[PDB]
Design an enzyme around this catalytic site. Structure first.
Site, PDB file in Angstrom:
ATOM      1  N   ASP A  81       0.845  -1.182   0.000  1.00  0.00           N
ATOM      2  CA  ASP A  81       0.000   0.000   0.000  1.00  0.00           C
ATOM      3  C   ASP A  81       0.891   1.247   0.000  1.00  0.00           C
ATOM      4  OD1 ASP A  81      -2.427   1.304  -0.169  1.00  0.00           O
ATOM      5  OD2 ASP A  81      -2.966   1.039   1.960  1.00  0.00           O
TER       6      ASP A  81
ATOM      7  N   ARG B 155      -6.559  -5.501  -0.339  1.00  0.00           N
ATOM      8  CA  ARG B 155      -7.195  -6.827  -0.316  1.00  0.00           C
ATOM      9  C   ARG B 155      -8.112  -6.989  -1.532  1.00  0.00           C
ATOM     10  NH1 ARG B 155      -8.784  -6.769   6.015  1.00  0.00           N
ATOM     11  NH2 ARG B 155      -6.859  -7.668   6.902  1.00  0.00           N
TER      12      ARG B 155
ATOM     13  N   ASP C 231      -2.432 -10.974   7.376  1.00  0.00           N
ATOM     14  CA  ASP C 231      -1.867  -9.679   7.720  1.00  0.00           C
ATOM     15  C   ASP C 231      -0.343  -9.796   7.740  1.00  0.00           C
ATOM     16  OD1 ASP C 231      -4.406  -8.697   7.782  1.00  0.00           O
ATOM     17  OD2 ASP C 231      -4.505  -8.477   9.991  1.00  0.00           O
TER      18      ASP C 231
ATOM     19  N   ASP D  37     -13.671  -5.329   7.876  1.00  0.00           N
ATOM     20  CA  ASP D  37     -13.382  -6.752   7.817  1.00  0.00           C
ATOM     21  C   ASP D  37     -14.590  -7.536   8.355  1.00  0.00           C
ATOM     22  OD1 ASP D  37     -12.879  -5.887  10.459  1.00  0.00           O
ATOM     23  OD2 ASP D  37     -11.278  -7.389  10.784  1.00  0.00           O
TER      24      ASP D  37
HETATM   25  O1  LIG Z   1     -23.454 -15.927  25.426  1.00  0.00           O
HETATM   26  P1  LIG Z   1     -22.953 -14.491  24.833  1.00  0.00           P
HETATM   27  O2  LIG Z   1     -22.946 -14.508  23.189  1.00  0.00           O
HETATM   28  O3  LIG Z   1     -23.761 -13.343  25.314  1.00  0.00           O
HETATM   29  O4  LIG Z   1     -21.469 -14.412  25.333  1.00  0.00           O
HETATM   30  C1  LIG Z   1     -20.406 -14.971  24.596  1.00  0.00           C
HETATM   31  C2  LIG Z   1     -19.392 -15.511  25.599  1.00  0.00           C
HETATM   32  O5  LIG Z   1     -19.051 -14.533  26.577  1.00  0.00           O
HETATM   33  C3  LIG Z   1     -18.111 -15.943  24.869  1.00  0.00           C
HETATM   34  O6  LIG Z   1     -17.380 -16.842  25.742  1.00  0.00           O
HETATM   35  C4  LIG Z   1     -17.194 -14.742  24.479  1.00  0.00           C
HETATM   36  O7  LIG Z   1     -17.893 -13.618  23.954  1.00  0.00           O
HETATM   37  C5  LIG Z   1     -16.240 -15.228  23.429  1.00  0.00           C
HETATM   38  O8  LIG Z   1     -15.162 -14.282  23.410  1.00  0.00           O
HETATM   39  P2  LIG Z   1     -13.674 -14.832  23.042  1.00  0.00           P
HETATM   40  O9  LIG Z   1     -12.852 -15.162  24.230  1.00  0.00           O
HETATM   41  O10 LIG Z   1     -13.949 -16.163  22.125  1.00  0.00           O
HETATM   42  O11 LIG Z   1     -13.041 -13.653  22.121  1.00  0.00           O
HETATM   43  C6  LIG Z   1     -13.839 -13.146  21.052  1.00  0.00           C
HETATM   44  C7  LIG Z   1     -13.650 -11.650  20.902  1.00  0.00           C
HETATM   45  O12 LIG Z   1     -14.711 -11.134  20.088  1.00  0.00           O
HETATM   46  C8  LIG Z   1     -12.290 -11.381  20.252  1.00  0.00           C
HETATM   47  O13 LIG Z   1     -11.309 -11.410  21.284  1.00  0.00           O
HETATM   48  C9  LIG Z   1     -12.287 -10.021  19.528  1.00  0.00           C
HETATM   49  O14 LIG Z   1     -12.941  -9.057  20.354  1.00  0.00           O
HETATM   50  C10 LIG Z   1     -13.052 -10.155  18.232  1.00  0.00           C
HETATM   51  O15 LIG Z   1     -12.167  -9.773  17.171  1.00  0.00           O
HETATM   52  P3  LIG Z   1     -12.556 -10.236  15.665  1.00  0.00           P
HETATM   53  O16 LIG Z   1     -14.152 -10.589  15.706  1.00  0.00           O
HETATM   54  O17 LIG Z   1     -11.752 -11.390  15.220  1.00  0.00           O
HETATM   55  O18 LIG Z   1     -12.377  -8.920  14.730  1.00  0.00           O
HETATM   56  C11 LIG Z   1     -11.483  -7.863  15.088  1.00  0.00           C
HETATM   57  C12 LIG Z   1     -12.321  -6.592  15.346  1.00  0.00           C
HETATM   58  O19 LIG Z   1     -12.305  -6.263  16.745  1.00  0.00           O
HETATM   59  C13 LIG Z   1     -11.782  -5.406  14.520  1.00  0.00           C
HETATM   60  O20 LIG Z   1     -12.362  -5.461  13.200  1.00  0.00           O
HETATM   61  C14 LIG Z   1     -12.076  -4.043  15.243  1.00  0.00           C
HETATM   62  O21 LIG Z   1     -10.925  -3.648  16.006  1.00  0.00           O
HETATM   63  C15 LIG Z   1     -12.280  -2.888  14.310  1.00  0.00           C
HETATM   64  O22 LIG Z   1     -13.679  -2.505  14.233  1.00  0.00           O
HETATM   65  C1  LIG Z   2      -4.703  -8.992  13.915  1.00  0.00           C
HETATM   66  C2  LIG Z   2      -6.067  -8.637  13.434  1.00  0.00           C
HETATM   67  O1  LIG Z   2      -7.112  -8.963  13.973  1.00  0.00           O
HETATM   68  N1  LIG Z   2      -5.957  -7.800  12.424  1.00  0.00           N
HETATM   69  C3  LIG Z   2      -6.935  -6.792  12.097  1.00  0.00           C
HETATM   70  C4  LIG Z   2      -6.405  -5.490  12.711  1.00  0.00           C
HETATM   71  O2  LIG Z   2      -5.079  -5.228  12.228  1.00  0.00           O
HETATM   72  P1  LIG Z   2      -3.899  -4.672  13.167  1.00  0.00           P
HETATM   73  O3  LIG Z   2      -4.574  -3.780  14.170  1.00  0.00           O
HETATM   74  O4  LIG Z   2      -2.998  -5.836  13.551  1.00  0.00           O
HETATM   75  O5  LIG Z   2      -3.046  -3.744  12.165  1.00  0.00           O
HETATM   76  P2  LIG Z   2      -2.069  -4.376  11.049  1.00  0.00           P
HETATM   77  O6  LIG Z   2      -0.741  -3.674  11.114  1.00  0.00           O
HETATM   78  O7  LIG Z   2      -2.088  -5.887  11.136  1.00  0.00           O
HETATM   79  O8  LIG Z   2      -2.776  -3.873   9.689  1.00  0.00           O
HETATM   80  C5  LIG Z   2      -3.701  -4.701   8.977  1.00  0.00           C
HETATM   81  C6  LIG Z   2      -3.176  -4.970   7.581  1.00  0.00           C
HETATM   82  O9  LIG Z   2      -3.467  -3.825   6.781  1.00  0.00           O
HETATM   83  C7  LIG Z   2      -2.302  -3.406   6.093  1.00  0.00           C
HETATM   84  N2  LIG Z   2      -2.290  -1.962   5.973  1.00  0.00           N
HETATM   85  C8  LIG Z   2      -2.095  -1.198   7.050  1.00  0.00           C
HETATM   86  C9  LIG Z   2      -2.069   0.186   6.893  1.00  0.00           C
HETATM   87  C10 LIG Z   2      -2.262   0.749   5.634  1.00  0.00           C
HETATM   88  O10 LIG Z   2      -2.246   1.985   5.481  1.00  0.00           O
HETATM   89  N3  LIG Z   2      -2.465  -0.029   4.576  1.00  0.00           N
HETATM   90  C11 LIG Z   2      -2.479  -1.363   4.706  1.00  0.00           C
HETATM   91  O11 LIG Z   2      -2.664  -2.073   3.690  1.00  0.00           O
HETATM   92  C12 LIG Z   2      -1.115  -3.939   6.884  1.00  0.00           C
HETATM   93  O12 LIG Z   2      -0.009  -4.230   6.032  1.00  0.00           O
HETATM   94  C13 LIG Z   2      -1.672  -5.181   7.545  1.00  0.00           C
HETATM   95  O13 LIG Z   2      -1.388  -6.351   6.769  1.00  0.00           O
HETATM   96  O14 LIG Z   2      -7.230  -4.375  12.347  1.00  0.00           O
HETATM   97  C14 LIG Z   2      -7.350  -4.184  10.930  1.00  0.00           C
HETATM   98  C15 LIG Z   2      -8.080  -2.873  10.645  1.00  0.00           C
HETATM   99  O15 LIG Z   2      -9.293  -2.813  11.401  1.00  0.00           O
HETATM  100  C16 LIG Z   2      -8.033  -5.434  10.350  1.00  0.00           C
HETATM  101  O16 LIG Z   2      -8.386  -5.311   8.958  1.00  0.00           O
HETATM  102  C17 LIG Z   2      -7.084  -6.613  10.588  1.00  0.00           C
HETATM  103  O17 LIG Z   2      -7.517  -7.829   9.973  1.00  0.00           O
HETATM  104 MG   LIG Z   3      -1.582  -7.605  12.914  1.00  0.00          MG
END
Ligand SMILES: O=P(O)(O)OC[C@H](O)[C@H](O)[C@H](O)COP(=O)(O)OC[C@H](O)[C@H](O)[C@H](O)COP(=O)(O)OC[C@@H](O)[C@@H](O)[C@@H](O)CO
Ligand SMILES: CC(=O)N[C@H]1[C@@H](OP(=O)(O)OP(=O)(O)OC[C@H]2O[C@@H](n3ccc(=O)[nH]c3=O)[C@H](O)[C@@H]2O)O[C@H](CO)[C@@H](O)[C@@H]1O
Ligand SMILES: [Mg+2]
Ligand SMILES: O=P(O)(O)OC[C@H](O)[C@H](O)[C@H](O)COP(=O)(O)OC[C@H](O)[C@H](O)[C@H](O)COP(=O)(O)OC[C@@H](O)[C@@H](O)[C@@H](O)CO
Ligand SMILES: O=P(O)(O)OC[C@H](O)[C@H](O)[C@H](O)COP(=O)(O)OC[C@H](O)[C@H](O)[C@H](O)COP(=O)(O)OC[C@@H](O)[C@@H](O)[C@@H](O)CO
Ligand SMILES: CC(=O)N[C@H]1[C@@H](OP(=O)(O)OP(=O)(O)OC[C@H]2O[C@@H](n3ccc(=O)[nH]c3=O)[C@H](O)[C@@H]2O)O[C@H](CO)[C@@H](O)[C@@H]1O
Ligand SMILES: CC(=O)N[C@H]1[C@@H](OP(=O)(O)OP(=O)(O)OC[C@H]2O[C@@H](n3ccc(=O)[nH]c3=O)[C@H](O)[C@@H]2O)O[C@H](CO)[C@@H](O)[C@@H]1O
Ligand SMILES: [Cl-]
Ligand SMILES: [Cl-]
Ligand SMILES: [Cl-]
Ligand SMILES: [Cl-]
Ligand SMILES: [Mg+2]
Ligand SMILES: [Mg+2]
Ligand SMILES: [Mg+2]
Lengths: 316, 317, 314
Positions: A41, A76, A92, A181
């Site tokens: 990027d 992507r 990533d 995502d």
């Molecule tokens: O019975 P409920 O559904 O009310 O409760 C569910 C249970 O309590 C369950 O045990 C836990 O929710 C399961 O949590 P965990 O220990 O399996 O962890 C899941 C979390 O969601 C995870 O640690 C992250 O918070 C989720 O991340 P991702 O869904 O993989 O996506 C990254 C996302 O946060 C990112 O796109 C954002 O930073 C940007 O908007």
């Molecule tokens: C570990 C995990 O759960 N990863 C998520 C997390 O990434 P995370 O917070 O780990 O940030 P990362 O550095 O992994 O960046 C995500 C990816 O985007 C790329 N990148 C970053 C900056 C940029 O300007 N352009 C670019 O293409 C990076 O090379 C990397 O491969 O948050 C992102 C943004 O919400 C999600 O899409 C990722 O899937």
């Molecule tokens: Mg990462």
């Protein structure tokens, strides 16, 4: 036609990228059966990242964007246009694949006609945590969104059937910096039936190293995806899915504790206003499927009452 | 003139009624001194209930209603018109009387000039529980509503002086499916002074077998109206105290007490709380000081018609 | 020109006054270097109080008001007009001074060019408690309002430089029965720089609808935000926020919301509290102790239910 295209966007990664690329090139899968597409990027790190990528000329496909897009969406999307494989796997740039990730996930997927295969996540370092509950029942050939906690694992760091992406014209949106995502995975889940979970190894290792107008626009798209799902056509099922997503949003959403935070009052009001406007487009029929600890917080948001959200948070 | 009329409405009870009727016929009281009035609310159980009742023809008075009324109000009202006894005793069709229930309750009542006598309740089976606090002080010749927890025992499964019912034209209302028995007992309590409590035996055995609130809150409204128009409790401060104590019982044991945090549809919650608010806002705030203070916030929330506040109040209880 | 004028209003004190007056007359300071001005707020105790005061004819200056003012404001204002001393010291009629109070406080003040000197408080009997935190760091020559907890010690039972009071025409207001002493000290603090704290002894022993009240609280915030000493707007926000904290911690009727107060009275009280606090910039809120974040917002929103809830969570 290859089995898997690994799509990896890069940006100012430097010498850290070696470890990642090496993990993809060192797979148990036949090397001719997959490809690594690298999309930079427009790094600006005095050519350090580009220099690391140049060392694998001939062994990977590579494109550089003219301007930095800011997130991973455009990169992507570029990778998807470049792939003609059966499945794609988003990786990533700082993360690692287990030696038997592509082989094991592809085999499990092929043997269960899977549209989506999710490999158990591992994590190295303090920072972002990874999903755990989805993997607590071991391997699941035909997983269910609700019963297998899939709304708590909405990263795109999984193996997706390209035909589903192609037939339904699923692209990463760029209207927001976050939750793009999630929207992608939700769009995919709502347009496919067969999801499998493989847990024999930690197949994917995550390595750790404002007013909400755009954020809530994306959340709105997630609810729209659920309620327009051609797979989950039953309105009550949609309510259940919507309710479960609402639960995940209240448990893990961006700025979940904004109400009692050091945020300026005017900012809190604007944030809650966007959150309220968005959640009030979601049928109240979904509310009964939200975990009941959040019953008050949800109603407070619906009512757009900052005091009530503050109180709700104090009781959680 | 008989001492007691036992009034018992029936509806699709079947062979279960034998036990109940037997318990009434097998009383220590002289059989000629009481009557069992059975009012069937048009059972439709292929004549099973009617067949059980027919077996006692000549030992009971009996009337059948043409259409099923749905609750016990119309049947009980019919029984009251039929009774010319000194006291009446309302008995539900699945329940039992102790052998010495009519005798002991009538005697205690007569010896204390009681308008109302309450016999200790027993219970058979899991389900509805029965009042306990009212009976914790043993026998009470001249009981008090507040001090003897009578607002926590407002069933009509008691012995009532018919003259009080007659003079004050007290009928069971039929505008609601619930709380009609409460309104009856409250109307009675507010038109009489002498209440006695007898606890020597479990005299009445409750047997367990294995809305937007427009009508419900209309009945609650009638309860508050009864208190505030009481010719016995004429002092306005006493009325506030009674009203406050009833409010406490309503918040402790009311229908859908936890509606606010429930899976009830939002529009239904709003309509329910609107009726609850409209009703409680006709009650003077002077009564609020007599409400148990844990409920201070919930009560104010209802007065303010604020759903969020009621939800929070419930979370803090 | 005397060093110190002790100003003491009296009202129906009786034979208890002997102890107080004795404590002032028995100071280590040269008796010719100070005066005790006694202002009786028209006692009506069958001449008992006046009889005690008469016993010290020749040793004290004395004026009697024609009608009882109701509080200590008018009496203290009368004492101020009567004093031509370098410093004044306000003393309540039931309280006591330590033998070396005037001497030690005046000396410390003079040696540090102090506009205000605060002597450590002691207390006799159950009732009102006294400030403690202000005195926990020992003696402080140049104290700071925030760092030395001065907003938690806003009584006028201190030594004040008369020039600051005259130059700025600082009088006790009479719009309220309460918090008038706070307003005075705040007005003084906001018009002076040099504050000193002396803790060697317990120098002063304390012996045991809100329309008007919130008008006074309003004056306190006005004093902070018009301060010619603390001119920086962010500093004003910090001071205002710290006062808000003290108000929520120690204010009159702080727990009114869940109290036995009549509902209509609660509404009127909160309405006055809301109207007053909503004239204070929200920029000050970030300087309020965060436990009170919800209560403060509830008051700003004028939501009785929210204040009730806030109090239940504290
Ligand atoms: O019975 P409920 O559904 O009310 O409760 C569910 C249970 O309590 C369950 O045990 C836990 O929710 C399961 O949590 P965990 O220990 O399996 O962890 C899941 C979390 O969601 C995870 O640690 C992250 O918070 C989720 O991340 P991702 O869904 O993989 O996506 C990254 C996302 O946060 C990112 O796109 C954002 O930073 C940007 O908007
Ligand atoms: C570990 C995990 O759960 N990863 C998520 C997390 O990434 P995370 O917070 O780990 O940030 P990362 O550095 O992994 O960046 C995500 C990816 O985007 C790329 N990148 C970053 C900056 C940029 O300007 N352009 C670019 O293409 C990076 O090379 C990397 O491969 O948050 C992102 C943004 O919400 C999600 O899409 C990722 O899937
Ligand atoms: Mg990462
Ligand atoms: O806080 P205070 O001290 O003022 O009172 C609380 C005390 O702890 C009090 O003594 C106890 O609550 C008394 O409870 P209890 O053990 O004596 O009895 C429990 C209930 O009163 C009883 O089990 C029923 O909940 C009450 O129903 P009834 O009075 O028999 O009337 C029937 C009525 O509920 C019915 O019309 C409804 O089902 C229709 O809505
Ligand atoms: O929360 P922070 O970090 O800002 O600080 C909180 C600390 O715990 C702090 O040390 C304490 O709040 C204050 O410590 P303290 O033990 O010295 O408290 C002294 C009290 O303020 C004192 O007992 C009185 O409440 C204040 O006395 P004055 O204001 O000087 O008396 C006049 C006026 O307050 C009086 O009219 C009012 O008390 C009438 O209600
Ligand atoms: C243990 C206890 O507190 N019991 C109460 C409970 O009865 P419960 O919940 O036990 O309901 P029941 O079946 O006993 O009904 C009460 C009586 O009403 C009669 N019946 C029932 C249905 C009908 O359509 N017509 C009819 O006449 C039954 O024969 C019975 O004798 O709720 C009733 C309705 O508020 C009250 O009157 C009862 O005092
Ligand atoms: C320890 C402490 O902080 N006490 C304060 C408290 O007094 P507190 O509650 O201690 O009441 P006090 O007995 O000390 O009375 C305050 C003083 O005012 C005088 N008085 C009283 C009644 C009257 O009608 N006229 C009159 O002049 C008394 O003589 C006395 O010297 O509230 C007063 C008014 O907010 C403050 O100035 C006092 O500093
Ligand atoms: Cl999120
Ligand atoms: Cl009573
Ligand atoms: Cl009820
Ligand atoms: Cl105060
Ligand atoms: Mg029954
Ligand atoms: Mg509220
Ligand atoms: Mg005093």
């Amino acid at each position: 036609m290859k089995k898997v295209s690994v799509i990896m966007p890069t940006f100012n990664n430097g010498e850290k990228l070696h470890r990642t690329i090496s993990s993809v090139l060192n797979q148990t899968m036949k090397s001719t059966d997959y490809e690594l597409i690298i999309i930079d990027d427009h790094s600006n790190d005095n050519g350090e990242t580009l220099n690391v990528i140049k060392k694998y000329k001939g062994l990977v496909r590579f494109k550089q964007l003219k301007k930095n897009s800011g997130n991973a969406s455009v990169p992507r999307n570029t990778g998807l246009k470049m792939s003609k494989a059966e499945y794609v796997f988003f990786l990533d740039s700082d993360d690692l694949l287990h030696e038997r990730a592509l082989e094991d996930l592809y085999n499990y997927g092929k043997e269960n006609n899977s549209d989506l295969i999710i490999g158990k996540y591992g994590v190295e370092g303090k920072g972002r945590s990874v999903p755990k509950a989805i993997f607590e029942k071991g391997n699941v050939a035909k997983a269910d969104i609700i019963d297998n906690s899939i709304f708590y694992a909405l990263s795109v760091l999984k193996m997706f059937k390209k035909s589903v992406i192609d037939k339904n014209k699923i692209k990463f949106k760029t209207f927001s910096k976050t939750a793009e995502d999630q929207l992608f995975t939700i769009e995919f889940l709502m347009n496919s039936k067969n999801y499998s979970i493989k847990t024999d190894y930690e197949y994917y290792i995550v390595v750790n190293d404002s007013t909400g107008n755009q954020y809530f626009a994306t959340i709105n798209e997630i609810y729209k995806a659920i309620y327009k799902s051609p797979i989950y056509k039953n309105q009550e099922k949609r309510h259940q899915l919507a309710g479960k997503y609402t639960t995940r949003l209240l448990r893990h959403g961006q700025k979940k504790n904004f109400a009692n935070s050091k945020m300026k009052y005017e900012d809190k009001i604007e944030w809650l206003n966007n959150f309220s406007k968005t959640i009030n487009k979601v049928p109240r029929d979904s509310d009964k499927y939200v975990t009941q600890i959040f019953n008050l917080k949800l109603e407070a948001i619906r009512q757009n009452d900052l005091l009530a959200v503050m109180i709700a948070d104090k009781l959680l």
